[PDB]
Design a protein around this nucleic acid. Structure first.
Lengths: 176, 93, 1083, 93
DNA sequence: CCGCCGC
RNA sequence: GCGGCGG
């Protein structure tokens, strides 16, 4: 949801001894898939700082006990020599897509908000095959395959989905 | 499009005529108070956040709605210019 | 990603130095890189020798011109508004009548701009471009007569503008007609003047004409010879002393009027060949020996009589033939003005020869850099030819760097006469793109030059061909002159070859702009490549061969307006020039020599060459382009890498990996949605916004000055007179706004105070963003040119991220242009059998009417590339073919449907249903298995697609693929002012704007009529009153509305009132009247 | 009472009428005085002759009484001298 | 035709 | 008023 590099003021800046630009980095961060375990974790702030000749990968974040990062080898940046990179990246549990302009998170006055990508699913596909058993051949066999970034599971999603569907079905109760 | 614009047009001898009557009538709806209507009972205009179009959303909408019915009369010289506005203030608070 | 290219026409030689036009033109223009011992013969030095040997006795001669210490550096010139010029002086020596004495010395005569490595210039702050120019190359031509279908007339045209316009005509009544500048005179009269005697003249001239009876006629004026020189002078319109005052005749002699173009090929070319033969000197110049020599005159007439007689050689000259059309390279353009300055200086020095004590006068007393500087300076900053460098994106600037204009000096071509010039002439082949011209007025008049088109010694755009002998094709290429190309029978490059031997009997060729089927024995020359027929700009459209020329244009021009996107993607399908454009354009940074990398900073890149040198290459971090676009160099090399010579170290603005990229490759379904893609609307998937697919960075440069009023200097400080502290936060630096701050509409960007007050640069309504760079120029100026009155200047750079939204307009290289109508949630947009949804949905309907199949092609090939994971390079006319694409699509079916078979499942009940409607449609061969069927349907370039909203298929295969589409410099940021009320002009009472208040749209009479017609009485009244002039009307109106009331009735518009008085102010008495003609009061 | 403006008329101005529309006569040539933006009297900007400088002012007129007559260039230099034609003197010379 | 952007 | 783009 938001990021802050120590010596950087705006999203369009460049950090010494650091190939990639702020924009190139934050972009790569939206590719970061984290996973919390309990509601008690609404807004977690991951912290990371590495220096010198090294490659910063999402595993270099200092562990946050209950919440885990399934996006380890994600390339965050490449550091040359005297490459000082210390940053705090804010994370949240939400739903849908939120433009960095809509929320505008401000932990530190000089931090830059990032675009929100909350769908834990990349793609859904369903097929309707002809038969399994039955008196009549004209039958439907629905098999749906779901794909998840890792945050939640195929089954987990399916269930929540089913629930949201049911939840709406009830809204047909009180006429007027 | 509009509510019975067809009916409306058929009530006047000329298009532009309609507009004029429509307008001036919207004027009287607000000037001499907003209760100077003729079809306020059941079947009067309405809005959807609440049923408050019953007070003062769009004037013209009323006008036309009122003219659709044989309540009002319009003519070249129906009533003496000045006398009209004097009597109206008196009977409308 | 593998890169496969389908080129079969052996592209013999690589494309030339794309910006050579300007580059070399300036190099040869001002030979300042090499010594004067071998100093050139043209440009600068030539213009020097021109007006240098001064003779008023006085004698000031040229020695050597040297220049080379650039006051300041490029960037500095931009940040300081300074013009990047070189200091220019030269050694001049003055010889005296007193043979024993002479004077040598040096005088600096102004600064001349320099040419960047890209080819652009830097005048006052910004970068400008000197565009090419075309015209009637000063020569001699013969065109048919106006009305009289009889005989034709002769023309003699030499620039510059000062030079005389000569024509030659023969009439019924009698003899010759040689009109110079609005008047005519006997052609003989002059001949006699020069020495051509009746006898000698007639003999050699009429030895075949019989017209001669036209010339030998003088029996009265033809018997006096010199006296005819005086006779001619009388024929000057003005009354002047008949004492041999060569003057006006001196004018059309050798010096000014005709031309000082390089002796030999400049004008002489039009001589030798076209008519007559040898040239003496530079022009019809010879005022030596009391008598005159004009080896040009008689020939012109000597061809007139040949022209009207036989076929001594058929010379009917086609004006527009590029062979009588020259292109003015920057150099010639700058050099031109240079000699004008040279002339202007030479003017005063002659005056300063009689003005002073002999030896008391030396260099200074004869030289004043005043003329030359104003001269040159004027051209770069005032000439209608030097302009803002269209830098929306590199390519753009590059085109604008090489386009040819007809309008300019005015002596070459004007506005109201062009139907003839506007056409793409026969000769434009390989010399002028037939597609690059712009739509609308100014069409065909301004156009970019061709691929291999390179300007020769004197303009005539030459093009490359391949000499062929017998059935053998050669690599020996020659750059022919438009005229020389007609002499031969050239053939196309499409001609099948077995290496060096032709392959067919009836092999196409074009004689002289005429299509002719020739034999292998007659093919004298062959075309180099199809590329040369078009421009660089055009050469970028994939399947141009399948695209109507009219829309192709839209396609070429649209690339010029592509905007730099953070994520730059090269086209899934390319032409073959993308690499080159980024390369000769200077977007990306290449490695000079082989070696290794040292430091790969995000601001600099230091590499060590294996030869013995380690260089630090800074990378323009984030610079403000002329058009307000991001220009960053993103290193693509890792620390310690062995780099090959000429390898991309860092990527340019839109060129990622070294390829040109503008916009991105998106998956696209080509079908109709509700109406969201009605006439030319486009539907976009929210999914695109999510991966910042289409996002460009933009910068706006707001500038404020601390003017010096006689009321008290406008200071620049944090002191905001009206007591705000909440609006003074961001403005932390005393006066300036802090870097990294978020400026919204109405915040203070810079503060200032002036006399009776807060005058502060605020964020103009619309938007601002994040302040990223700031510039302040205080008192002790380092090397900047601060205008007068201007105490100090403050520049504030602001930027923001442009995410694609509904107003934005994108478009493909073929010509499909359009705006985003609805941003659809991936949730319910057209998805493929396998979860993959599409990105954009183009409305089919916009393809038939406009003729650009090319896009539907790109999409098919693009479909293969998606599942084949590969990019392709399809040449202009020689690219990929319909069979080869189906072949790659067949390969793609094994990736798409192949993994499908193994992954564990078969065909959907949906897939079967659309197959039914497809066979009944005639897309699939009835009787084959769904597997087989779908393949045949995929090869067609169409697959099955389910709705997404209903999950039900869309009856009928729909084509889909990777189409390369771009976002244009059209943000809606420039498209919406919403005004309720505000500032009015104090002179006319118009809601003009300026800072906080937007303007109101004009209503014009064109629109009033619109209203009148409707019978829109008050709607019209309102537009002329309550909304414009009745200061009491608009007032009552405002109030009323504040009250939720009914606007008052209109009083006499001040315009009425103002008229009564304007009419009272004069005798006229305008009195308004009542029913019965009586008075009435406006007041 | 007050009537819709149906006809407008252009006529010549009687000197008497010039005084009629007139409020005061501008008698002196004092444009602007620095001391007080307050108008310097009886030149141009005086308030009696035109009206109150504070909160119908820009609707009144003043007259200057010329010593010896002068004429309207509009009636003398128009292609056909309105006076030259009428009087019969050389129309233009 | 209208709208903008800049010496 | 000069120049550039868009419909």
């Amino acid at each position: 949801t938001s990021v802050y590099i120590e010596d950087v003021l705006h999203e369009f800046s460049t950090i010494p001894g650091v190939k990639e630009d702020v924009v190139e980095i934050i972009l790569n961060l939206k590719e970061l898939v984290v996973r919390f375990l309990n509601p008690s974790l609404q807004t977690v702030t991951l912290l990371l700082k590495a220096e010198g000749p090294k490659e910063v990968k999402a595993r270099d974040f200092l562990p946050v006990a209950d919440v885990e990062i399934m996006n380890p080898d994600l390339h965050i940046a490449t550091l040359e020599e005297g490459g000082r990179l210390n940053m705090e990246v804010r994370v949240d549990r939400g739903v849908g897509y939120v433009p960095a302009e809509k929320h505008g998170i401000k932990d530190r006055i000089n931090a830059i908000p990032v675009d929100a990508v909350f769908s834990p699913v990349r793609r859904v596909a369903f097929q309707v095959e002809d038969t399994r058993l039955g008196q009549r051949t004209d039958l439907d066999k629905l098999t749906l395959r779901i794909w998840t970034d890792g945050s939640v599971t195929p089954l987990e999603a399916l269930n929540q989905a089913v629930e949201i569907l049911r939840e709406h079905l009830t809204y047909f109760s009180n006429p007027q | 499009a509009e509510p019975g614009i067809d009916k409306l047009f058929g009530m006047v001898d000329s298009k532009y005529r309609l507009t004029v009557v429509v307008a001036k009538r919207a004027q009287q709806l607000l000037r001499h108070g907003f209760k100077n209507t003729v079809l306020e009972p059941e079947e009067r205009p309405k809005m959807q956040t609440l049923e408050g179009l019953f007070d003062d959303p769009n004037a013209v909408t009323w006008a036309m709605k009122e003219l659709l019915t044989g309540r009002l009369v319009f003519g070249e010289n129906l009533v003496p210019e000045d006398r009209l506005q004097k009597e109206m203030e008196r009977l409308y608070p | 990603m593998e890169i496969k290219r389908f080129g079969r026409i052996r592209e013999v030689i690589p494309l030339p130095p794309l910006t050579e036009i300007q580059v070399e033109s300036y190099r040869r223009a001002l030979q300042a890189d090499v010594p004067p011992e071998k100093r050139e013969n043209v440009g600068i030095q030539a213009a020097f020798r021109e007006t240098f040997p001064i003779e008023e006795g006085l004698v000031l001669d040229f020695l050597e011109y040297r220049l080379g210490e650039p006051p300041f550096p490029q960037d500095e010139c931009r940040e300081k508004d300074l013009t990047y010029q070189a200091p220019l002086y030269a050694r001049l020596q003055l010889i005296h009548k007193d043979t024993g004495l002479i004077k040598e010395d040096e005088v600096f005569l102004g600064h001349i701009p320099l040419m960047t490595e890209d080819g652009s210039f830097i005048i006052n702050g910004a970068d400008r471009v000197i565009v090419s120019q075309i015209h009637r190359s000063p020569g001699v031509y013969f065109t048919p007569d106006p009305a009289r279908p009889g005989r034709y007339i002769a023309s003699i045209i030499p620039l510059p503008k000062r030079g005389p316009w000569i024509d030659l005509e023969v009439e019924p009544n009698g003899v010759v007609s040689m009109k110079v500048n609005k008047r005519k005179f006997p052609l003989v009269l002059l001949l006699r003047v020069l020495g051509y005697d009746q006898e000698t003249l007639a003999r050699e001239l009429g030895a075949y004409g019989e017209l001669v009876q036209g010339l030998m006629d003088e029996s009265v004026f033809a018997m006096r010879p010199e006296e005819a020189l005086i006779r001619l002078f009388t024929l000057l319109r003005p009354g002047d002393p008949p004492k041999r005052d060569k003057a006006v005749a001196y004018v059309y002699g050798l010096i000014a009027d005709p031309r000082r173009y390089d002796l030999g090929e400049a004008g002489r070319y039009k001589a030798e060949e076209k008519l007559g033969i040898r040239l003496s000197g530079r022009t019809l110049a010879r005022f030596e020996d009391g008598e005159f020599k004009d080896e040009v005159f008689l020939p012109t007439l000597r061809y007139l009589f040949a022209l009207t007689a036989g076929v001594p050689g058929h010379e009917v000259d086609d004006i527009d033939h590029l062979g009588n059309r020259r292109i003015r390279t920057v150099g010639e353009l700058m050099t031109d003005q240079f000699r004008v300055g040279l002339a202007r200086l030479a003017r005063g020095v002659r005056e300063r020869m009689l003005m002073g004590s002999e030896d008391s006068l030396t260099p200074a007393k004869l030289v004043n850099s005043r003329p030359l500087e104003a001269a040159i300076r004027e051209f770069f900053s005032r000439s209608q030819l030097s302009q803002f460098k269209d830098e929306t994106n590199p390519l753009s600037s590059l085109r604008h760097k090489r386009r040819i204009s007809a309008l300019g000096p005015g002596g070459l071509t004007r506005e109201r006469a062009g139907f003839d010039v506007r056409d793409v002439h026969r000769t434009h082949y390989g010399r002028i793109c037939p597609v690059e011209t712009p739509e609308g007025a100014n069409i065909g008049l301004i156009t970019s030059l061709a691929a291999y088109a390179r300007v020769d010694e004197l303009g005539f755009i030459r093009t490359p061909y391949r000499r062929v002998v017998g059935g053998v094709v050669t690599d020996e290429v020659v750059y022919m002159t438009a005229t020389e190309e007609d002499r031969y029978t050239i053939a196309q490059a499409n001609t099948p070859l077995e290496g060096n031997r032709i392959a067919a009997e009836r092999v196409v060729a074009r004689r002289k702009g005429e299509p002719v089927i020739v034999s292998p024995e007659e093919v004298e020359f062959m075309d180099v490549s199809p590329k040369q027929v078009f421009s660089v700009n055009t050469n970028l459209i994939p399947f141009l061969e399948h695209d109507d020329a009219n829309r192709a244009l839209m396609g070429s021009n649209m690339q010029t307006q592509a905007v730099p996107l953070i994520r730059a993607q090269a086209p899934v399908v390319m032409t073959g020039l993308e690499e080159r454009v980024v390369r000769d354009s200077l977007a990306a940074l290449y490695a000079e020599e082989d070696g290794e990398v040292a430091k790969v900073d995000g601001n600099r890149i230091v590499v060590r060459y294996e030869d013995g040198r380690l260089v630090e290459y800074p990378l323009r971090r984030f610079y403000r382009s002329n058009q307000g676009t991001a220009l960053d160099q993103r290193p693509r090399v890792v620390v310690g890498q062995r780099v090959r010579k000429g390898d991309l170290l860092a990527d340019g603005p839109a060129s990622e990996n070294g390829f040109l990229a503008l916009g991105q490759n998106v998956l696209v379904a080509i079908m109709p949605f509700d109406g969201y893609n009605f006439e030319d609307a486009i539907v976009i998937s929210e999914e695109l916004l999510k991966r910042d697919f289409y996002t460009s960075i933009h910068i706006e440069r707001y500038e404020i000055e601390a003017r010096d009023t006689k009321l008290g200097p406008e200071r620049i400080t944090r002191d905001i007179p009206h007591l705000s502290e909440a609006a003074l936060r961001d403005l932390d630096e005393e006066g300036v706004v802090r870097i990294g701050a978020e400026v919204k509409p109405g915040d203070i960007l810079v503060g200032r105070t002036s006399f009776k007050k807060d005058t502060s640069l605020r964020v103009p309504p619309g938007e601002g963003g994040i302040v990223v760079r700031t510039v302040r120029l205080r008192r002790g100026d380092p090397g900047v040119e601060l205008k007068p009155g201007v105490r100090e200047v403050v520049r504030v750079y602001v930027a923001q991220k442009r995410k694609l939204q509904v107003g934005d307009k994108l478009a493909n290289r073929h010509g499909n242009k359009g705006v985003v109508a609805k941003i659809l949630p991936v949730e319910d947009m057209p998805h493929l059998p396998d979860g993959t949804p599409v990105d954009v949905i183009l409305n089919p309907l916009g393809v038939p009417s406009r003729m650009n199949l090319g896009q539907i092609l790109e999409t098919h090939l693009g479909l293969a590339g998606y599942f084949l994971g590969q990019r392709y390079i399809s040449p202009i006319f020689d690219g990929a073919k319909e069979p080869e694409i189906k072949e790659l699509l067949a390969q793609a079916f094994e990736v798409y449907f192949g993994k499908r078979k193994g992954e564990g499942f078969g065909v959907d009940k949906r897939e079967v249903e659309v197959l039914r409607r497809a066979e009944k449609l005639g897309l699939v061969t009835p009787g084959k298995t769904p597997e087989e069927q779908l393949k045949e349907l995929f090869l067609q370039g169409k697959v099955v697609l389910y709705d997404g909203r209903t999950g039900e298929p869309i009856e009928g295969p729909i084509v889909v693929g990777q189409m390369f589409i771009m976002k244009l410099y059209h943000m809606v940021e420039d498209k919406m002012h919403a005004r309720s009320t505000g500032p009015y002009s104090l002179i006319t009472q118009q809601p003009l704007g300026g800072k906080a208040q937007f303007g109101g749209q004009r209503f014009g009479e064109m629109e009033v009529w619109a209203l009148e017609a409707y019978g829109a009485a008050h709607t019209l009244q309102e537009m002329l009153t309550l909304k414009s002039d009745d200061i009491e009307g608009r007032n009552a109106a405002y109030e009323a509305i504040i009250k939720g009331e009914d606007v008052p009735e209109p009083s006499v518009p001040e315009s009425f009132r103002v008229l009564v008085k304007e009419l009272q102010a004069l005798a006229l008495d305008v009195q308004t009247l009542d029913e019965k003609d009586n008075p009435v009061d406006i007041f | 009472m007050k009537k819709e403006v149906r006809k407008v008329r252009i006529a010549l101005a009687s000197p008497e009428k010039i005084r009629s529309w007139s409020y005061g006569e501008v008698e002196k040539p004092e444009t602007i005085n620095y001391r007080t933006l307050k108008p310097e009297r009886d030149g141009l900007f005086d308030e009696r002759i035109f009206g109150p400088i504070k909160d119908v002012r820009r609707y009144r007129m003043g007259h200057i009484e010329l010593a010896t007559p002068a004429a309207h260039i509009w009636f003398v230099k128009d292609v056909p001298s309105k006076i030259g034609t009428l009087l019969d003197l050389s129309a233009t010379e």
